[PDB]
Symmetry: C3
Subunit: 132 residues, 3 copies
């Protein structure tokens, strides 16, 4: 329900996902679609990476994405398309296992690649578009 | 379950998110779909130069893989009810930036006179050893 | 405010062609509008006024990229304040801090969703490329 003179773009700010400090928001909702920033494997509780391994960072990324999606009114089952960026193509298999477990039976469209490097030395970054 | 001849086929045959599954494009075996349709738009996965008929790459060269990528995109789009002419935006990823020129020629030939918005870059490496990967959004 | 100008003047897809941003001389358009959303190509730091990069540095190219994006968006009928999501690509991750200062300056108080990474390389040896989706 409306709370006085709702806008075309809505900022999503989950207190469970890493804080968007800086020139970006965790996600923006526009015309019923949720446009999510590329999450990295930071744990909001410590402000640091969940660990130094692709396994630990990948699990934290997928958890962070869930937090943002649920905050927006969306969910993992409503994700339309993801893009999955790795610091090292050799880590793609371990990533894929964790990604598949996080989505269960739901299978978004996807594009993946190894970047030359990611912000903050992250080993993995995942962004997505979802629906309400 | 799915629609046939652009008509519903029972509760379950139509839903907010529709999985696109062309038997002509590489099979999506793992945790992704070739494309997802949502609110009249088709969100396509990054195609790589695999030939569904063999389960393997169309060839070892940038020319053969780029042609296969474009053809695969066409199969997925047309399966969804879209087409190359309805592509809105692509992202073109290369394993070697020096391949930009040859890739561009094949990409342009596939789109004819249609000109999607585009972003291009060379990745450090692509899934499955691909030389080229192209994803896109299109409209129905 | 805008009105149709005869059958064929308006279509499902609209090409955005700002004369102030670098001309799209290849098989692409600066942006495409579809169903009230504007899908912008990756801008690199070319200056329309010269036809060359604004400068050799990350500072000059980042400022020019943000300006180019603003020109495409305003041509389309959108604006920096209506940007929903950007993807920011760098030739070198060490340039992230300088790029980010210029990006934040350009957006002011508006905070789109964002993904960033360094590529192995960008077209024409560009140091920075930024694409986006925005609403009308």
């Amino acid at each position: 329900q409306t709370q006085g003179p709702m806008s075309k773009l809505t900022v999503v700010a989950s207190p469970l996902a890493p804080e968007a400090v800086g020139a970006y928001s965790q996600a923006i909702i526009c015309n019923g679609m949720v446009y999510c920033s590329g999450q990295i494997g930071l744990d909001r509780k410590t402000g640091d990476f969940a660990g130094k391994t692709i396994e630990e960072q990948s699990k934290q990324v997928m958890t962070n994405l869930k937090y943002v999606l649920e905050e927006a009114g969306s969910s993992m089952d409503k994700v339309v398309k993801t893009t999955c960026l790795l610091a090292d193509i050799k880590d793609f298999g371990v990533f894929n296992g964790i990604y598949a477990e996080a989505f269960g039976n739901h299978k978004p469209a996807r594009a993946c690649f190894a970047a030359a490097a990611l912000p903050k030395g992250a080993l993995v970054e995942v962004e997505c578009i979802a629906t309400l």
